[PDB]
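Example complex used in Figure S2.
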Amino acid sequence: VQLVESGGGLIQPGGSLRLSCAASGLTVSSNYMSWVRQAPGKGLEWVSVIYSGGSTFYADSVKGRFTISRDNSKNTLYLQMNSLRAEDTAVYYCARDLDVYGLDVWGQGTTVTVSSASTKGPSVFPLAPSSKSTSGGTAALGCLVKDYFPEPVTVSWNSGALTSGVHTFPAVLQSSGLYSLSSVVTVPSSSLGTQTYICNVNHKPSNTKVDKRVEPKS
Amino acid sequence: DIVMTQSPSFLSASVGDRVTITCRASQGISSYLAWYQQKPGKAPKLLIYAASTLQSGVPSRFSGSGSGTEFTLTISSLQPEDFATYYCQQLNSYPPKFTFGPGTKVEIKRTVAAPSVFIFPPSDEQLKSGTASVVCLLNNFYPREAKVQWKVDNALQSGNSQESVTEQDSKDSTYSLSSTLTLSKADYEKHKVYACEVTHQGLSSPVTKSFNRGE
Amino acid sequence: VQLVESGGGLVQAGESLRLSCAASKPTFRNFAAGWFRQTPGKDREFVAVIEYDGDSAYYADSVKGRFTISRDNAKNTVYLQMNRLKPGDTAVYICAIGGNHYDPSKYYTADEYDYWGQGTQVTV
Amino acid sequence: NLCPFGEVFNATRFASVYAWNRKRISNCVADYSVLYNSASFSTFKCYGVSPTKLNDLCFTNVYADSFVIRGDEVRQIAPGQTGKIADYNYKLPDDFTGCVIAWNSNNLDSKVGGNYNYLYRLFRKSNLKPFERDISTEIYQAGSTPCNGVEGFNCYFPLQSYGFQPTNGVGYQPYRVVVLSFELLHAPATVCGPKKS
Ligand SMILES: *[C@@H]1O[C@H](CO[C@@H]2O[C@@H](C)[C@@H](O)[C@@H](O)[C@@H]2O)[C@@H](O[C@@H]2O[C@H](CO)[C@@H](O)[C@H](O)[C@H]2NC(C)=O)[C@H](O)[C@H]1NC(C)=O
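Predicted assembly (754 residues):
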């Protein structure tokens, strides 16, 4: 028994997107099928449910803009999303609803991102070590991945050779609608003048690959 | 609209501890309560329905009780795979079909570890573009509760900083925090001292790392 | 069963307009028909209601003496003769259809109805 | 002879909604002052008839349907409504000519630990026809594998129990509902009000 979701992606405000939920091990037309969404860094919220008899119900936040449907020959649930706003950005889950028994079968989820921001390559700025970056034999350094859209970005250190002590932080959305991220690493302070340190930032949506060399400071 | 609440929001415990998390309702919802477990990046998993009945396949250490306005989710012996976030869900509601709770994050407990603080001046490449981002880093600390205050010429700075926290590390069960202070190049050159003050349990007093513009 | 409102548009103060709400099924004769307005930004607000026989009607105080309700079950349509229109009346007017209640106060609540429509935008 | 309204309204026990009761009212005088004076009804709405003139009208035959549902589900006892009650338990027709009467019954159908003797149908492949009663208890097949009378995954009992506790909210509290159906055929009238014959 499984639910396979697809359809999510990037869309601009006022656009449309169709979600799909392929089912195996259960019959969609004979079950309460519901869509649940969870905003990033937030909780879960109900969206729509389709009865086994065809009755459809929607939350007030999506009524008139969303349309739930099913295809019996494909055993697949659908969620048509029109006139999308930024607040509709969430990971959408299709699930089999058993009422008082709960939601037992869940899908892996698909990501819906609604934003007017353009796809922009990241700007990588070096985070150089110094005495203010040292803690008695341990020196810290990193790279600042600023102003990129959309997610995600991948950061490796010295072509994937440096892994110990590396901390890549979760990205935060700024007031500009763009993402910023920092990846740091703690290295012995005795290696600043000998070992070279390079961060490898790759942003596939913008085809941007940057290798910035973090040189020490005063 | 019946309001659902959960307490606490965050909770630390060790393997083998008795874990009790509470979900409350503004009105009497009888036994129309379901408990779920969600791990980072995964879909919610049904644990208990009808506020007391265990779902097939769920270990017996999970227990549900309560009826009316107060409900409890109990894990008798905490296990390494139970460290996740737990939600409660009211069933057969109106107007919405079902309403979830705020959730409770169960995290691993360990000894108090003080944070190592590093402040990083802006790069000259970024200063050419007209922006200046100053980054403060808090590495390998516990508990997660810590305060990072940005000071510019000893003036407490608010409204121009953003924080990001890593999840609990797989090895030492610690956290890592980064605070980025962003301001224009013109504003950055009007001041001299940029300080980052950190208050934490493992620190006997707030530690401040500062730099002066122009080295 | 579908409810389609018509007869809306742009008008000025003092001038009049008549609204209509046709019903898809001939069952309209057994229900009570009411009118609501949802000014953009705000929520629904009661206007008027007519019973299935038309022997009893109730208006809101804001439109009492200015608006008039009538119905013709042969055409399955409600009528709202809107006179002395003021700029505040600018709203999407929706027609609701439900039961004939023993307590007339239930007509003031929108949740006491059963069918609703799409709405027609009136601008003064 | 007066019409038997106490046995329907003053009934000590009401039926489950999936197995709703129907009582045929015929050859009697019907005084609705029993319902007029009582200020306990939360819902009193009539279709094709005004609730105030019921003492002046006559009908060829009157049906009285009664059951217990939640307060949040009373709105589904109306023409053209949707929901678990309207689709799988009790469906009023779009041409319904009659009255719907409901009142709170938390004092009569709620138990401290929980009254679980009131049931509704939760699982059904298709929506009910108007005025249809489904008393089947066959195991519902939610997948492609047959159940063969055994409960399990994708194989569930079709009926569910209300949890009626006195500490429940008004939407979760039990409400007793009486549905009066009126027919006017080319036949002698059997149920008349006191104002008329
Ligand atoms: C069955 O009927 C009795 C009749 O009493 C009511 O009196 C009025 C309040 C009016 O509202 C009508 O419903 C009835 O005529 C119900 O009430 C009991 O009445 C007796 C006196 O006759 C009184 O001593 C009891 O306390 C009343 N009980 C109550 C109010 O709970 C009675 O409740 C009805 N039972 C059912 C199951 O409907």
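Chain A touches chain D at residues 1, 25-27, 30-31, 51-55, 57, 98-101 (CB under 8 Å). Residues 2-114 of chain A form a domain with the Immunoglobulin-like fold (CATH 2.60.40.10).
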